[PDB]
């Protein structure tokens, strides 16, 4: 393959600067790797890669990738080739990938329209294929730079995988039958739709509200309220799926029941020992919904409740009454309330200052290994 | 087994108060549940379990497990039994187990005696099976006592199981040649020994120094000073093991490798995505020792300089001047020069307010999957 070669490149060079993270704003070391890529076979060749060595060459002039990320908002292959440096995805240094786009609903992308491409990966280089990966944001360069029309690309087919490895197993284990008919069975050309609604949905209410990031991104990041975040967007995903007529009904279902199983089960025991942010977010709506009916656990298995819709709005209409304060209150003040909506739901250890994954979902981590 | 058919019928009572640990102080279910361990054919007949269904029928008078913490702190048999509720083992509910002894050193057990058991696993019911279990303490039963002369145990077989699947590996993959000679190849019952000295001098270091625990446990909960105080112990462990002149040599060199081994790499990489608070405590002593001539990064792979034994005494001395101010300012100021040492030398996300795997220890997990 001409692109498997062009990868064994990439991933040649990667492993020469592996060592020169700190290096990777010097000019000195730019200039010796912008030439390494431009003397590169099948690489240098590259429009994408022509791109990359001009803006690395020019980088003490301008730090910004205006050439790649030109290329790459532009859509003019579907190569992505850049020098990254993102502190939670640290498996990224030089990188390339191609891809492939998704079929997308026109009412949905018209609706909730926003920069971002559910794609599969065709090929990867190392860094890439690293099962945190499952995004690229525009600030994930190394330049740091995100501009709100940016192409925010998210990895389809790991979330197809981690639904088939992860997901499929605990409806098994934790839902009552029938809880989720329409994903009982489906291939992943189904999951695969289901996700790339979920991803668009997602980024779009991720700028709706009146907290929106990236504008208050620094008050989101506490550990419950980043995943407090996602779950504020995927809940409206949710709600969307339910509620808009102008989306096809069997299409809207399936990435209904996608979102609620993602968030209910599959987000709801990650992190060992204790839960990461999607987690305690998870592990908040499993408790709001147990309290309010919108679920019940007979003997440990869930029974989603008829009047789960209207548990989920009442829910999303709670987060949206602490975070309309801000417009009297400081965002400050708001995160408090954020925080303690979030940890009467939490099993949240006040000395250490941290969470515990709640008793439900710890057995079933034991259970079966998730 | 007389012991098999005794947790047989632990496990099947275990199994029915699944869920009912809302219950596990209410003396309705508690009498009904001494009711069945009394009437257990095997299980109702064993001295300690005598004693439970004794202690949990008086439990709405006396809300402890005397006749069961007495008959375990008096050694009667290897037997233990009890109704515990420890939130970081929420895997034990009620559980049984039968114990081996370890040979042990009299200077080691005279000179730094604690009431520490390192003891082997040999029979247990399913909640003590967990990995996450890895010792007993007093305050794990249901009352919640803990006594400066209560016996505490440490399951030295799951020590051994998690040295041959994690610590040996990174020795192979991360250690210069070498480094950890008497540790190359060890049996088990080699590896068991230098576990038991390392527990014995965990649990007696905890009670030395200017802010023990017990008495200050409270301060020292929060993520990286929990981490930080097993780190104070362990390296006070390690230099015992080397200035003692009264520790039998190979014993105590053995000793001195395997804790180093386990603090420089098993504990460095817990914890996905983020640090536990082992592993923090291990990144902070991973970027001391570097920056202060202890060991060294050649090609990759950790060299241990000659003179690492000065840089640990330093690095503990360190400890022990930031703790020693307890006699002069408050435990919040200790707290805050504790937690202003670590972030020196760990990667702490202030917006977060969390840590990072540092990046020589992500690459490690990535690569071998730890
Ligand atoms: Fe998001
Ligand atoms: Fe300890």
């Given at each position: 393959?001409?692109?498997?070669?062009?990868?064994?490149?990439?991933?040649?060079?990667?492993?020469?600067?592996?060592?020169?993270?700190?290096?990777?704003?010097?000019?000195?070391?730019?200039?010796?790797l912008a030439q390494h890529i431009?003397?590169?076979?099948?690489?240098?060749?590259?429009?994408?890669?022509?791109?990359?060595?001009?803006?690395?060459?020019?980088?003490?002039?301008?730090?910004?990738?205006?050439?790649?990320?030109?290329?790459?908002?532009?859509?003019?292959?579907?190569?992505?080739?850049?020098?990254?440096?993102?502190?939670?995805?640290?498996?990224?240094?030089?990188?390339?990938?191609?891809?492939?786009?998704?079929?997308?609903?026109p009412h949905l992308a018209a609706?909730?329209?926003?920069?971002?491409?559910?794609?599969?990966?065709?090929?990867?280089?190392?860094?890439?294929?690293?099962?945190?990966?499952?995004?690229?944001?525009?600030?994930?360069?190394?330049?740091?730079?995100?501009?709100?029309?940016?192409?925010?690309?998210?990895?389809?087919?790991?979330?197809?995988?981690?639904?088939?490895?992860?997901?499929?197993?605990?409806?098994?284990?934790?839902?009552?039958?029938?809880?989720?008919?329409?994903?009982?069975?489906?291939?992943?050309?189904?999951?695969?739709?289901?996700?790339?609604?979920?991803?668009?949905?997602?980024?779009?209410?991720?700028?709706?509200?009146?907290?929106?990031?990236?504008?208050?991104?620094?008050?989101?990041?506490?550990?419950?309220?980043?995943?407090?975040?996602?779950?504020?967007?995927?809940?409206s995903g949710m709600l969307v799926?339910?509620?808009?007529?102008?989306?096809?009904?069997?299409?809207?279902?399936?990435?209904?029941?996608?979102?609620?199983?993602?968030?209910?089960?599959?987000?709801?025991?990650?992190?060992?020992?204790?839960?990461?942010?999607?987690?305690?977010?998870?592990?908040?709506?499993?408790?709001?919904?147990?309290?309010?009916?919108?679920?019940?656990?007979?003997?440990?298995?869930?029974?989603?409740?008829?009047?789960?819709?209207?548990?989920?709005?009442?829910?999303?209409?709670?987060?949206?009454?602490?975070?309309?304060?801000?417009?009297?209150?400081?965002?400050?003040?708001?995160?408090?309330?954020?925080?303690?909506?979030?940890?009467?739901?939490?099993?949240?250890?006040?000395?250490?200052?941290?969470?515990?994954?709640?008793?439900?979902?710890?057995?079933?981590?034991?259970?079966?290994?998730?």
């Open positions: 393959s001409p692109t498997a070669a062009v990868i064994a490149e990439v991933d040649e060079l990667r492993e020469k600067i592996k060592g020169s993270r700190n290096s990777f704003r010097d000019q000195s070391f730019l200039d010796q431009a003397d590169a076979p099948h690489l240098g060749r590259q429009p994408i890669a022509r791109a990359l060595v001009e803006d690395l060459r020019g980088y003490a002039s301008e730090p910004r990738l205006a050439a790649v990320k030109a290329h790459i908002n532009e859509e003019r292959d579907q190569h992505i080739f850049s020098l990254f440096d993102a502190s939670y995805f640290p498996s990224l240094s030089l990188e390339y990938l191609t891809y492939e786009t998704l079929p997308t609903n609706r909730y329209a926003s920069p971002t491409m559910p794609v599969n990966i065709i090929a990867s280089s190392k860094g890439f294929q690293s099962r945190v990966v499952v995004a690229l944001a525009p600030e994930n360069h190394i330049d740091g730079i995100q501009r709100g029309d940016d192409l925010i690309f998210y990895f389809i087919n790991k979330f197809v995988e981690r639904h088939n490895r992860i997901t499929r197993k605990m409806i098994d284990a934790v839902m009552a039958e029938g809880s989720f008919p329409l994903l009982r069975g489906a291939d992943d050309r189904t999951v695969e739709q289901a996700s790339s609604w979920w991803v668009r949905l997602h980024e779009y209410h991720h700028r709706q509200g009146d907290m929106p990031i990236p504008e208050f991104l620094r008050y989101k990041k506490l550990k419950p309220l980043a995943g407090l975040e996602e779950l504020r967007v995927d809940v799926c339910l509620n808009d007529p102008e989306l096809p009904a069997d299409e809207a279902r399936l990435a209904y029941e996608y979102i609620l199983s993602e968030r209910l089960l599959r987000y709801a025991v990650e992190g060992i020992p204790r839960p990461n942010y999607d987690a305690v977010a998870s592990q908040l709506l499993f408790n709001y919904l147990s309290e309010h009916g919108g679920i019940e656990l007979h003997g440990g298995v869930i029974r989603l409740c008829p009047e789960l819709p209207a548990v989920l709005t009442e829910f999303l209409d709670r987060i949206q009454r602490i975070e309309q304060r801000i417009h009297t209150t400081s965002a400050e003040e708001v995160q408090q309330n954020l925080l303690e909506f979030t940890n009467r739901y939490t099993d949240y250890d006040p000395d250490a200052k941290d969470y515990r994954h709640i008793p439900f979902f710890a057995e079933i981590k034991e259970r079966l290994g998730v």
